[PDB]
Design a protein around this ligand. Sequence first.
Ligand code: ICS
Ligand code: ICS
Ligand code: CLF
Ligand SMILES: [Fe+3]
Ligand SMILES: [Fe+3]
Lengths: 472, 470, 522, 522
Amino acid sequence: MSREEVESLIQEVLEVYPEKARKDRNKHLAVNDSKKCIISNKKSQPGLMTIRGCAYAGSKGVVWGPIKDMIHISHGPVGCGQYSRAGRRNYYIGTTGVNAFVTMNFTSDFQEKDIVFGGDKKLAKLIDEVETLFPLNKGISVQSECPIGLIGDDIESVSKVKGAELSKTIVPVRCEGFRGVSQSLGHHIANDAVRDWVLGKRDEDTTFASTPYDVAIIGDYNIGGDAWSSRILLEEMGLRCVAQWSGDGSISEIELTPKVKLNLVHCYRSMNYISRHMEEKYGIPWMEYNFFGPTKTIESLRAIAAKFDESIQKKCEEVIAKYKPEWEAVVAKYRPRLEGKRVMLYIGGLRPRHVIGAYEDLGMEVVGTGYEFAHNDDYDRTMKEMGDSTLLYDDVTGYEFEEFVKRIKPDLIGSGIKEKFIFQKMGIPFREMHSWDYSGPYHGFDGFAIFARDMDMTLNNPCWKKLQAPWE
Amino acid sequence: MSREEVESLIQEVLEVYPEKARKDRNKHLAVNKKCIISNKKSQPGLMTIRGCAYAGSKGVVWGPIKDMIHISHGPVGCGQYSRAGRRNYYIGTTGVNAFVTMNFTSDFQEKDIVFGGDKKLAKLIDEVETLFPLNKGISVQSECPIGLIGDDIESVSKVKGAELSKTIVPVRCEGFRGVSQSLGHHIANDAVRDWVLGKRDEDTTFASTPYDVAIIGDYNIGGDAWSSRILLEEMGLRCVAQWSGDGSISEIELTPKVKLNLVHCYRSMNYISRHMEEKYGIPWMEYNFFGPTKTIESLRAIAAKFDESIQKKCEEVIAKYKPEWEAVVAKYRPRLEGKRVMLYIGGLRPRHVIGAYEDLGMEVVGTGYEFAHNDDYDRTMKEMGDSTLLYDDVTGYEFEEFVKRIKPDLIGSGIKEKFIFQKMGIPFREMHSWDYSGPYHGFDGFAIFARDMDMTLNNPCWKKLQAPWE
Amino acid sequence: SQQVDKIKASYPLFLDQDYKDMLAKKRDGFEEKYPQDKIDEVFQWTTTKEYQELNFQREALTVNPAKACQPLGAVLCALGFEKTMPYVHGSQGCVAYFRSYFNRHFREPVSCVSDSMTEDAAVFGGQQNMKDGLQNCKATYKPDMIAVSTTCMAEVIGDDLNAFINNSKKEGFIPDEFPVPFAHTPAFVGSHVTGWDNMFEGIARYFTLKSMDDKVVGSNKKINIVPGFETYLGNFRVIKRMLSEMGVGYSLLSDPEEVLDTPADGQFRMYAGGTTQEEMKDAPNALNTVLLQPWHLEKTKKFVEGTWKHEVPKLNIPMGLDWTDEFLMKVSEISGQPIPASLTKERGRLVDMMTDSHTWLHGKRFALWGDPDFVMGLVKFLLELGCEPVHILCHNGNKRWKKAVDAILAASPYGKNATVYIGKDLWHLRSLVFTDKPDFMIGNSYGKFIQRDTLHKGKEFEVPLIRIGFPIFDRHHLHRSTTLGYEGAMQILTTLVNSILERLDEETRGMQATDYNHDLVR
Amino acid sequence: SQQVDKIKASYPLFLDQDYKDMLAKKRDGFEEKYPQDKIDEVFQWTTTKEYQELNFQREALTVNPAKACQPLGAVLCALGFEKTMPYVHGSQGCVAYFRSYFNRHFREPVSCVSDSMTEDAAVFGGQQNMKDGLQNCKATYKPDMIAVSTTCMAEVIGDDLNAFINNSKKEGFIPDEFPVPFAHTPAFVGSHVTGWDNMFEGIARYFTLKSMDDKVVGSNKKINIVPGFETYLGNFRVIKRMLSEMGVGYSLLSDPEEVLDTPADGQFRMYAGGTTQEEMKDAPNALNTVLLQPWHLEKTKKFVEGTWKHEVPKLNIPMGLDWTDEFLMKVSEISGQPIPASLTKERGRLVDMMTDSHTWLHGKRFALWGDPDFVMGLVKFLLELGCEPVHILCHNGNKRWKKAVDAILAASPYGKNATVYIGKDLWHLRSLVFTDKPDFMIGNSYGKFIQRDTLHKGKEFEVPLIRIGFPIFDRHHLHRSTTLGYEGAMQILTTLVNSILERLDEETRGMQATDYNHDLVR
Ligand code: ICS
Ligand code: ICS
Ligand code: CLF
Ligand SMILES: [Fe+3]
Ligand SMILES: [Fe+3]
């Protein structure tokens, strides 16, 4: 570390690029010291092995897919729906194939006939087939893949007509992968789709009996149960969680959300659009919070409780007092085993800053972090969590990440599946920070225990001392 | 396939032997008193298929008794190789009230060889009682060294038995005794007589009926005894006991109260059957539940010993199962018709399964026993065809050379024979363990038997032995 | 709550009473969920033959397909060439999914790039992406070759790959002699295996088409081997092992075994092994070319026969006993090398295993699926084992393939109750294993949800899954296995018989109820 | 009854109502069975720590041992020599059991003779049995060598094998030049592995003791390998494989791999392969001798060092990562051959697999048993995997061995909850897995009865068995597997992780109960 040594690193790594790429990538790498440091949310340079996905991944994979009692159509060729089937652990309670459908792959399996004639009448026949074979579904979304927009199909027309014919909520989503620069625009497109086609359904219904403690978890996709480990705390504090967007979410939960008193935003990146909308149209305020680690979770519980009355603030301190011996035993056991270890992170749009406090609660240091698709308001929030002279990388290339790791030599890397086996072969412990490496939850006090044992089990695993044969 | 041809087969194979072995083995090979010798010592070094007297007593007769604990008394070997090797099926909670598939042993060390194992035996009886309180009796199955070192398991049994008010059975079935498993049967029968069978001689509280019967010599291989018992009770009889297959010590003790003993395995259980007729007046009869012809014949003969109501129910049972076994023959006989079988088993099945093969149109061209006596061969003469091959205590060499010439379509024998003939390209079925299938007794067993003979004889694997470039 | 000495992950954490009460309250309060009796009623209905009839009338809706798209197969093919970077011209979301899909199956790095065509390129084409993309890829990851395929957005907008690459070389973005073979791989035609055939034929033409005057069939004394879409490391290894044992000269064209199995020794290796460009240039000089998976190598066949003038032998995939026999005898005839004693012995040890295990395999009823060549080889071997392949499903199969399989079934009594399904998927197959229940499924990881569905009806209706195929995500290192040759047949047999015995052991483990048949010896 | 189109074997035939009623009638009428409440109460008692205390106080009673008797190992050792007939002097019932035991494990013929000593030979000795037995055996089965061990009957009565064999040659029953090595193998001393050591030492003495004056250590430039009691074909194969990769001249002394794996090609081969007599004669000329399983080759070690004058290296069984490394580095030092790139890569691929699977293996608790060398190598590898071998049972283990394993445990945090038991049996182990429940057992087929017992207590108490060891009777062809070297470590790794994952899939397969965690990807 030296700021001088980190900046020399960046210069050297960039010397492999042709000039046009070098000048662009230079703007996406920076050393930490609000705004005027790094740019983001720009197009990826071709041929450099970005880790980013597409808008369809951002709409179908993250926002809509988790909704459990709807059927989501991957509309287009057979590819996107198959590669994304059950790849994200957005957990749910249901009877799959009967009343819930999250881990299934529904698709229109486009053939050349569909590219030439169009897919709109196939979509209509497909909607009828869905209704006969899955009668308990409570709504249908149509997740456009790349060809739908290019060929001039009109899924809006099919949605309106079939929706009126069957008295069904059918949501057209133009999340074609060529739109935008990453999964980020997929969040936006999906947010607007919820707004235009689902969120207003009960605008004019007042049957729901509201309480002053009504709340909704916005932007928790329940990876490994994260949202369940968050809901339990909020409700132990005296709140009523009317909805969960989108982890373990039902359509009715979403339709009920305009009735709550406060919107709790975990993932700002994916859900800030719909939260700002509900503040404009319904007057519902929203606030950001962080349930990673005891420090942040306690800070969040007290900040949320301050929005209500003394009874909620009292129950807040009761919840804090209850779990205190639990997370203090976690720290006592695992912090000595992880103290002073250095971590490099590369994830999507929220976790590269949100988990830093949980690492610091175990005496670990985040010497580098970065996002696939974050915007500049995300980096603004990142300047504060990260220490000075740490390395920041937006839309890092495969080449850059390897070179950064070779020089910095972190004790642990936390990133995605496309990165995991690269760094394990270099002998650096790796934890998946998307899928939690099939573990978790990591949210809340119950999630911190799992987080801690997971970081320790991998960082201190005996396999890491064996990489080099004793004869070389 | 001609008296002359079998005759010269026999002399040809015998030319390999030294003269001593040659002269002996000529007496044990014959083409069907005056024909063959049996129940003699095995010639050294010729790879007999035979076991020992401990196998005959512990493995066969006593081991199946499910609510007793049987001690393999001696070194660790015998009890371990014999643990759960024979499929004598039973209903029980193993380790608390039933013990068949467990291995209890005194694990003789050199201290026990030099000083005797009798105090170790008494200590091990106390430990059995501490850790297995629901056992209803203990037997001590002697391995080779017990007699050789001069231990007195009888004294330990009588003393500990009286101390604990427990049935403790000393069995001197040391493997060096006799010439095969056969003497183990006799020793085991005599141990039942001397230490178990007479416990309730002065007991009059059992409620008898005119139809009380006992199944003697069925060890419930794969459920055999269960698929026989059901037929007998559908015929109106009451099966008080089953020896030793799924058998309990109380069933044994109640056997002297029955009206008729039904002997399946003559060789292993005739001794105790003779005794029960001598002492209790209970008559006994042999029967055969292999295949529909023999089962129908056996049912009618057993019913004839009783009254018209039993003989009425006999014909009802026969009429009930008629469509079932006739469906079996309709499906499987055309697939096995005219196929030739060679058998080599123990003391009963080498003759008893012949009628079942014939019910599927199959021809038994060779058969023989490990340890049969002359009275078994007398009964075999009537079951086997003319000019077929008989072999007593066949050697591994002889069996292979016989098969090379005869070229049977299927061989039925034991585990030490199976993989030899499979490699030679000849379908093989295990006729001890039923190849982990069965039951084969009764009507329900004939269905499985036919299915098993067909699946193996006609399996696609047998046409693939020769490489196409060879 | 957690006990720090025995931390609980999601299972069984959420079975704690407080989580169960919280989940119950969420459902009752806000989910407006159908009543459990209605859910049970609809589930039971989805197991009926009435539902199945409706299921098989589907024309527009696909549910749980058993196939992927073309460019996935193009990537795998390109990965098999030395120091080659697979490059998919089009939108970048595809490449993220391609790499992840293979990451999860091989548990290895998977290198592949995109040229990130976006909204603007739909109106004016992706020419500039290709120019900057090839140059950036070349300079950054330093491959010796870049093998270009397409995403469906670039197919729909009609980008001329050939011209874009030629212009990239004309304008100086990459050197003229730098190898850039290409193939159009439309996701809306065929499947992943078609992408493999298209990519391979494209690489073949690139190194051969304009150089044929120099070539003499047989002059290099080798036999070309084209593996096709192949995801078991053992299958590449077993082929090269048998041919070496015979002393046959060979060229394995597309060989990813090294890149998909690098050691963890402290360094990441982007490239390793693989077919050299020279082996491709010299392939027309082979005695002949053998197609290990002919039913998805049609385009390649026409090129090697039409341009290389090789007389490609009519050979099935070398799976099972008969087809491994025929493969080796064909290789022996072409090369003049005799089948050595070591392979004759190995054949006999497979036959020996068949005789040892035939009583447990006989009459066992299987539902299975996968790619066309794999499926027919599995069907063939099952019949050789005396098993019944009752439900045979190939989503990406065609009519001519189905005829071939049907004639294979008709040549055996063990095919009497079998039906071959093409164009059908795993939701169709779910119905078949309910209405005509088999004993096991042989398929990929997606099969696990069918087993779960069958178990919900009842333990006596559960159909256990046996994982053979692609992808396998929920077991570790099965990608190391072998399914070809005698070695692969020995592995399949052992897997099959022991799955049968493991299930039997489960069904007879009940104390005093079913453990009379809980045999120590089987 | 039977339906001719779906014939039921014992399971499930006897679950039919008429059989069920008949079995209840039998019990109630004549079995005088303890009531089910008393049976339940006694079972629950056998699961407690109070029962375990009484269980461990046993001195005289053994229940379900995990060992066999000496001559079993002598037979296996003898089988490893070219055209050698194993010959056990004593009673014939033993040989019937030895053959059947190995028959069921290997699913192969097992050829061995007896000289059928009976009552009358127990009073006057078996000298005539030896004379006729050797002459009959040589004439009938044409062995090149006859290797003689003993039955416990023959040991107790004190037959002098050397005298009887010498008298047999004196009196012309077999030629004086015919090799008849012998060893006394009393069943009441040690175990089956002791009989292997004794048989081997006896054979080594027969061929070298008289001839040492012309021998020069190192002159043939080979390394002798002594495998010990070994029931995995892959373990012989992997040692020869690695040594040939290194280019190391070697001699495997006792090699039954061919005789235990003959092809099924239409003929039975009584003998096949094996260590030649010429190789045993030349063995003192090797550079050194390596014992693959030193803890049951003590007698062999003393003869090799005291007579051949080889400085046998102190090496553990080559199991796991560290001890395979040490094996190869010692072989390199002795032979002067470098460890080749192919083995370095294979080591790296095993380490790669360890990194891929470490999160599911970490902290997994195991109860295990077997022979001393096998057990300590499984313990070693488990620690290398981050697993906890909490119950370590070795019925035929000794005090110095236990000391060695305890030190291995003390060197790792993953051994802090482990205990090594010697002289304990599988009824002792049943108590440990109830009172201190592990996640799995690693053991032979006798462990299936422990899993049944644990399941009877409850599904949450079941401890599944992973079959690694000897004998394995209830699955097919596991005797083909490998446990030594990197290849064996990769196989063990894969079996362990996937047993963990199969168990997880079962516990999360319940629809709407636990299948929130029924992940496609693991
Ligand atoms: S939605 Fe986003 S990439 Fe906020 S697209 Fe991505 S389940 Fe990441 S850093 Mo995968 S903006 Fe969620 C995310 Fe974060 S799929 Fe998950 S882990 S908190
Ligand atoms: S008892 Fe006998 S050898 Fe009669 S010792 Fe043997 S379970 Fe055999 S031919 Mo194994 S006299 Fe029974 C027998 Fe027959 S063990 Fe079984 S099959 S009908
Ligand atoms: S960006 Fe789908 S994988 Fe592609 S080649 Fe067409 S089917 Fe196949 Fe995003 S929406 Fe999907 S994932 Fe890509 S295509 Fe576009
Ligand atoms: Fe890997
Ligand atoms: Fe075999």
